[PDB]
Design a protein around this ligand. Structure first.
Ligand SMILES: COc1ccc2c(c1)c(CC(=O)NCCCCNC(=O)CCC(=O)O[C@@H]1c3cc4c(cc3[C@H](c3cc(OC)c(OC)c(OC)c3)[C@@H]3C(=O)OC[C@H]31)OCO4)c(C)n2C(=O)c1ccc(Cl)cc1
Ligand SMILES: COc1ccc2c(c1)c(CC(=O)NCCCCNC(=O)CCC(=O)O[C@@H]1c3cc4c(cc3[C@H](c3cc(OC)c(OC)c(OC)c3)[C@@H]3C(=O)OC[C@H]31)OCO4)c(C)n2C(=O)c1ccc(Cl)cc1
Ligand code: HEM
Ligand code: HEM
Ligand SMILES: *[C@@H]1O[C@H](CO)[C@@H](O[C@@H]2O[C@H](CO)[C@@H](O)[C@H](O)[C@H]2NC(C)=O)[C@H](O)[C@H]1NC(C)=O
Ligand SMILES: *[C@@H]1O[C@H](CO)[C@@H](O[C@@H]2O[C@H](CO)[C@@H](O)[C@H](O)[C@H]2NC(C)=O)[C@H](O)[C@H]1NC(C)=O
Ligand SMILES: CCCCCCCCO[C@@H]1O[C@H](CO)[C@@H](O)[C@H](O)[C@H]1O
Ligand SMILES: *[C@@H]1O[C@H](CO)[C@@H](O)[C@H](O)[C@H]1NC(C)=O
Ligand SMILES: *[C@@H]1O[C@H](CO)[C@@H](O)[C@H](O)[C@H]1NC(C)=O
Ligand SMILES: *[C@@H]1O[C@H](CO)[C@@H](O)[C@H](O)[C@H]1NC(C)=O
Ligand SMILES: *[C@@H]1O[C@H](CO)[C@@H](O)[C@H](O)[C@H]1NC(C)=O
Lengths: 551, 552
């Protein structure tokens, strides 16, 4: 019914109805003109002719190790390439943000209401004849069938990049500060009103919760000691609400910033590590500033840990994921002579993309034990039983599952994968190929090209019929991986822009914040600029065990 | 006690305690170095030698009319010069914002908590020996004495720039969408969480209030018709909360986005005009888009009115205030190749600077009546009696008061002026001269230099003793005006950067928003780009009466 239902405008042109059966494309600043913005301007053709494909660039970044080592030791050159990585696809994220689940056109409501996830592509209008707009059948294929035929794990498929459980739980822990879906409102809504890396998963989303978690001495967070080891405090002691089954003993109801982090001992592990890190930084700052009060010690520590988090995410986490030989760098100064918006709004599609449950193993292997999902979930006695040191040693060695390549979602979380499919549809996501085009990728022309195989392709073809009707979320998990990589092209090219924007968009990266006095002087500053996943663990885990994001 | 109490760091260097009795200045990117960041780098000295004073630039913009007329007709240069005006304050504003009334150091709390006004200068710490830090006496002069001696009006002083009551109430109406102090929390808190030109004063701050105000047909706002004329609906009919004294008739409790706009008929006049404008834009969009629903018509109209507001504020309102011969221009495209943050946080100091009550006359003259404050306040029957047309005609003719130059606050609002002084102190504002340095102005070296005269200066010296202890708010109202101007240097140089930032920082000015389809196509876009105070009145007020921000 809506004449824009077919998504006729190309190259990020905007579709507007101009009557009941007519549309106009707004081609402003697309670099294209014509009825659906498909005729390139002269400068546009030039850019197209020279532009290498993502797969080409990825080849270059994952080969020529000798050249990159040279590059990695020339600071001017390293900065130049990193600046490039940051800016080079800046243009892909709308900032200030635009659409959301209820608005397929720009509006003050969509801009101003922070309870929404934002949208990289507007929803398919309600009165469109098909789920994807006009293509495909009246109904999408049964989600349970899509799940079982191409998503569910048969045999465990290990990640060829060697991601471990330290990585898997870091990813879960880190992302769950800004992926916090407000289920009473709906899948397109979030409880993370900071829309980014504010460390609310440690400090709490609201002031009241934060104040319940704080010691109000020396800037510190409340904690308890169990068997000589520092752990988070209890629900009983703090009165902060946590989600626990009713049979969890009170001494085991740990209280942390994020209410769901008692779900898994792997999350509780990182919650404990970061809590220890906060109180460590408090000690350092108190030493530097005996004249400071509790409030300033707390606030400054929080800013430093925000810095540490961004530092580690870029130079260890993203570094490992990328498989690049180039050494990524956290350096806000790189953007100071660039056009860049220091703000971020979390996209629903980013949330969708990041459902990396194929990472999960069949069992969680700690010391000599192999825990089932049933044994692991909501069981912090496991963390207490083995301790942090053994957790780190064990998880550093246990390999995680491959995310792309198909059929690697453990059946234990099959309902989660199904919900990702069903909620994608509920939120009226456009198709895989629409999203590929939105991020300057070539549409897939068959299911075999998507998977790079034959059997899953075929089951998919029977289910969806048209490649242009293939859905975003299942496509990510069945996509042909990059060579010996964890992800395919679509995951990387859509996810990377959201990721860097969410990291660099933080106010501590802005010129007025990025200076030593913000962090209590050069000592605080150095904590950020020398942070690593290894030093995080070394400083806060007894025995300073070796760790890494790969086995 | 705090070693930073004396504000030792200069040139926007940041002070940090490094112990109980020592400090360090962080001179990063200030262009200066040394212990208090006062030694300039080579590039800095050059920059300092060449850059003209504000008063010099003001002279240039308010003279050579023949030359400016040439420039005004050369788009490249008009654009170039406008781009310049925009990007020349752009650094003086911290964006993302930093301090607030409770935080004199940067913190996640100060950044993230939108209930605060932000601060251009951090508060004086609580444990400082004097209100201004270390200078001056233990307590500041009695605010009642400052008020009575140099602020209160003796004889009405007209604005030499000819500002009229259309201007004065436009200023009040426009600013009260982002100056909305949350008195339950304290003076450093705001209820305007949009922190800018979101037109909540028309549409309501919250979704619940907006929906009570909406007709939910054709995108329109609810209204009533009285004697053939369109007015806001009532509280009785909408359940929209408004502030009225209990003796106001039900049929006279008009309900609009901003709960305080029943305060004066002048606010209700503009509330009514903008209400009519919204529904007018709804008719236009419905004509262009018969296929659209109520929701999209409403949202699209709101975006258009936001655009119109920014347009009018720059090209009519700021144009008038400036007295420039150069013709200012609303054009977002000017910033597309510039470094610029499309965001804004309303500063407490901006609020303070905008307390322009000397604008108010002794009486409000409509048609052949002259209403006292007592008769004018909370009296919407006056608007009904005379009608919008007569309001516009009368307010266009009545001159407003000079704001700087001293002794021009009407006695009727003396408590408001005193509260501005007292709440500034409550919020631990730094001194006039600290704020002057913060905006790259030379500190005043005496009270006579501040006022440009002798009598008020002598009274201020008796009260404050030290010029470095003079307060920001009273200084603004007693400052030597620019020649035949409404304001002095401090008002302009502090206010202009906040103002432009608040206007251009709006998301509709960003490249992904600033395109025709955002506003329903070329017709909607054209409404924004051709808006003016005269067209706003001509389209919505019977008879298309002439209006202007200056007396004719
Ligand atoms: C693969 O393994 C992983 C996995 C995850 C990764 C990562 C890697 C990574 C790493 C990562 O993201 N690396 C980025 C690799 C760099 C990609 N570079 C390219 O594709 C080449 C693009 C290029 O150089 O040209 C651009 C460009 C391209 C354009 C374009 C404009 C521009 C644009 C441009 C603008 C111009 O001015 C108008 C130009 O003319 C002057 C111009 O030509 C010179 C180009 C860019 C520019 O100014 O500098 C680079 C240019 O319109 C049409 O296409 C992250 C961050 N990741 C994540 O954080 C992440 C996290 C979670 C998830 Cl789920 C996914 C990813
Ligand atoms: C007259 O009455 C009123 C009243 C109200 C007004 C207004 C007027 C106005 C109008 C308004 O905003 N007027 C502003 C006056 C004009 C401002 N222009 C200037 O100050 C020119 C400054 C200039 O040209 O020099 C800068 C400059 C200066 C520097 C500096 C760097 C630069 C910087 C610069 C950079 C350079 O390298 C690129 C330079 O070398 C090439 C360079 O030259 C050496 C200068 C700027 C630049 O690149 O272009 C202009 C340059 O380091 C320290 O000093 C508004 C908006 N108003 C309001 O909206 C308003 C509303 C409410 C309130 Cl309360 C107050 C105001
Ligand atoms: C370790 C055991 C894990 C379990 C038991 C688990 C289970 C769940 C469940 C039940 C949900 C809620 C689904 C819904 O409400 O519809 C969820 C959401 C999610 N999961 Fe996991 N998951 C695990 C690990 C991971 C990992 C390693 C990642 C990696 C990033 C991840 C990423 C996500 C994301 C991004 C969401 C959306 C969160 C939100 O929007 O609030 N999960 N998971
Ligand atoms: C026309 C009659 C006017 C009356 C009766 C009036 C009265 C008041 C009152 C009672 C306050 C509240 C003070 C407090 O709560 O401490 C106030 C604040 C204020 N006034 Fe006026 N005023 C008038 C006109 C104006 C005008 C023409 C301007 C021009 C800009 C203006 C600017 C302001 C501002 C910016 C505030 C602060 C508002 C806030 O922080 O919420 N007022 N006025
Ligand atoms: C952001 O938008 C959501 C979506 O409409 C708002 O939530 C609704 O609020 C209205 C009125 O307050 C209720 O009648 C609805 O039941 C709510 N719906 C949902 C799905 O929650 C929300 O209030 C908006 N947030 C703000 C701050 O305005
Ligand atoms: C923004 O800051 C204000 C001031 O700290 C917060 O208001 C306080 O909230 C606490 C606990 O919620 C109350 O005990 C105080 O009485 C409140 N003080 C004032 C002055 O209102 C407010 O909650 C903060 N907002 C957010 C979203 O964190
Ligand atoms: C662990 C989940 C088993 C899936 C059972 C439901 C039917 C799934 O379906 C089939 O599964 C076979 C098993 O590998 C594959 O050969 C087929 O291609 C697939 O279609
Ligand atoms: C795109 O424009 C072409 C004309 O160049 C037209 O034939 C076509 O119908 C348009 N859109 C679609 C979805 O086909
Ligand atoms: C919880 O973990 C302990 C190991 O500490 C294990 O023995 C126990 O069986 C687990 N509980 C459940 C219900 O699986
Ligand atoms: C600023 O530093 C100078 C040394 O350059 C010192 O004499 C002075 O005490 C400092 N501050 C003030 C306010 O005098
Ligand atoms: C309100 O205005 C009317 C004129 O319409 C006037 O007659 C009346 O006295 C005013 N009310 C008060 C309380 O002054």
């Amino acid at each position: 019914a809506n004449p824009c239902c077919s998504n006729p405008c190309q190259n990020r042109g905007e579709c507007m109805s101009t009557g009941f059966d007519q549309y106009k494309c707004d081609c402003t600043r697309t670099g294209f003109y014509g009825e659906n913005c498909t005729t390139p301007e002269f400068l546009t053709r030039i850019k197209l002719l020279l532009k290498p494909t993502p797969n080409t660039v990825h080849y270059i970044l994952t080969h020529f190790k000798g050249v990159w080592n040279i590059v990695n030791n020339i600071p001017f050159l390293r900065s130049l390439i990193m600046k490039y990585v940051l800016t080079s696809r800046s243009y892909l994220i709308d900032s200030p943000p635009t659409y959301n689940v209820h608005y397929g056109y720009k509006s003050w409501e969509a801009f101003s209401n922070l309870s929404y996830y934002t949208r990289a592509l507007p929803p398919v209008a309600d009165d469109c004849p098909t789920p994807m707009g006009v293509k495909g059948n009246k109904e999408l294929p049964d989600s349970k069938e899509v799940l079982e035929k191409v998503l569910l794990r048969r045999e465990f498929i290990p990640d060829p990049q060697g991601s471990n459980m330290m990585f898997a739980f870091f990813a879960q822990h880190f992302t769950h500060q800004f992926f916090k879906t407000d289920h009473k409102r709906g899948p397109g809504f979030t409880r993370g009103l900071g829309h980014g890396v504010d460390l609310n998963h440690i400090y709490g989303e609201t002031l009241d919760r934060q104040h319940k978690l704080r010691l109000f001495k020396d800037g510190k967070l409340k904690y308890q000691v169990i068997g000589g080891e520092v752990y988070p405090p209890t629900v009983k002691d703090t009165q902060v609400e946590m989600i626990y089954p009713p049979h969890i003993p009170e001494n085991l109801q740990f209280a942390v910033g994020q209410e769901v982090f008692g779900l898994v001992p792997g999350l509780m592990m990182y919650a404990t590590i970061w809590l220890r890190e906060h109180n460590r930084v408090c000690d350092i700052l108190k030493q530097e500033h005996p004249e400071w009060g509790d409030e300033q010690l707390f606030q400054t520590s929080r800013l430093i840990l925000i810095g540490e988090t961004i530092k580690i995410v870029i130079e260890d986490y993203v570094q490992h994921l990328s498989g690049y030989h180039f050494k990524l760098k956290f350096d806000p100064e790189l953007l100071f002579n660039q056009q860049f918006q220091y703000q971020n709004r979390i996209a629903s599609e980013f949330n969708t993309l990041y459902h990396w449950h194929p990472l999960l193993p069949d069992t969680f292997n700690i010391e000599d034990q192999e825990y089932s999902f049933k044994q692991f979930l909501y069981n912090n006695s496991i963390l207490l039983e083995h301790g942090l040191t053994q957790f780190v040693e064990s998880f550093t060695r246990q390999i995680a599952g491959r995310v792309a390549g198909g059929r690697n979602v453990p059946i234990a979380v099959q309902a989660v994968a199904k919900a990702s499919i069903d909620q994608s549809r509920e939120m009226k996501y456009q198709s895989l190929n629409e999203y590929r085009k939105r991020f300057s990728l070539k549409p897939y022309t068959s299911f075999e090209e998507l998977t790079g195989e034959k059997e899953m392709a075929a089951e998919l073809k029977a289910l969806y019929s048209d490649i242009d009707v293939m859905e975003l979320y299942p496509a990510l998990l069945v996509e042909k991986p990059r060579p010996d990589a964890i992800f395919g092209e679509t995951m990387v090219e859509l996810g990377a822009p959201f990721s860097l924007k969410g990291l660099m968009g933080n106010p501590i990266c802005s010129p007025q914040y990025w200076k030593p006095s913000t962090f209590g002087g050069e000592v605080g500053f150095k904590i950020i600029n020398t942070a690593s996943i290894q030093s995080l663990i070394c400083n806060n885990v007894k025995g300073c065990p070796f760790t890494s994001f790969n086995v």
